[PDB]
Design a protein around this ligand. Structure first.
Ligand SMILES: CNc1ncccc1C(N)=O
Ligand SMILES: [Cl-]
Length: 150
């Protein structure tokens, strides 16, 4: 409630969209994630180019659910050669560490009035997986999620 996510001077924020809620449950249990091949490459470049100077945040949402389900920070580069078949389907190859910060359902109603100037001014709730969020809009999103209460 303005107590959250001030002093976020640098850093970068991405939307994660999963059509497997089981995969997200596993992320929360073991603090790891895996995206598509092109998604992993985008997150890998953001994390590496940050060179530790700032956080990379991930805003998670289950496709079709109508709500965001929480926030985690990237905590490692992407390892592309890892054990196969750990996710809901075999097509997900690789792994990076994350640290979950919030696990809570925030309805899209609370966020849909934030639009992305880098995505044709579309609402942030209408994003695809690994859509990057401009820093000032991300700060608005993170703060709404942080303070939202049932
Ligand atoms: C492991 N990750 C996933 N699982 C299921 C559906 C989408 C994803 C994704 N784009 O990250
Ligand atoms: Cl909606």
């Amino acid at each position: 409630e303005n107590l959250y996510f001030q002093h976020m001077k640098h850093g970068r924020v991405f939307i994660i969209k999963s059509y497997s809620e089981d995969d997200i449950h596993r992320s929360i249990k073991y603090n790891i994630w895996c995206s598509t091949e092109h998604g992993n490459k985008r997150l890998d470049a953001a994390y590496r180019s940050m060179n530790g100077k700032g956080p990379v945040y991930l805003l998670f949402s289950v496709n079709g659910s109508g709500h965001f389900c929480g926030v985690a920070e990237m905590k490692s580069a992407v390892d592309y050669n890892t054990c196969a078949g750990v996710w809901s389907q075999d097509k997900w190859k690789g792994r990076f560490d994350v640290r979950w910060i919030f696990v809570k359902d925030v309805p899209n109603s609370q966020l849909r009035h934030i639009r992305l100037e880098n995505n044709e001014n579309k609402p942030v709730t209408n994003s695809r997986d690994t859509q990057e969020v401009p820093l000032e809009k991300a700060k608005q999103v993170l703060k709404i999620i942080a303070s939202y209460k049932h």
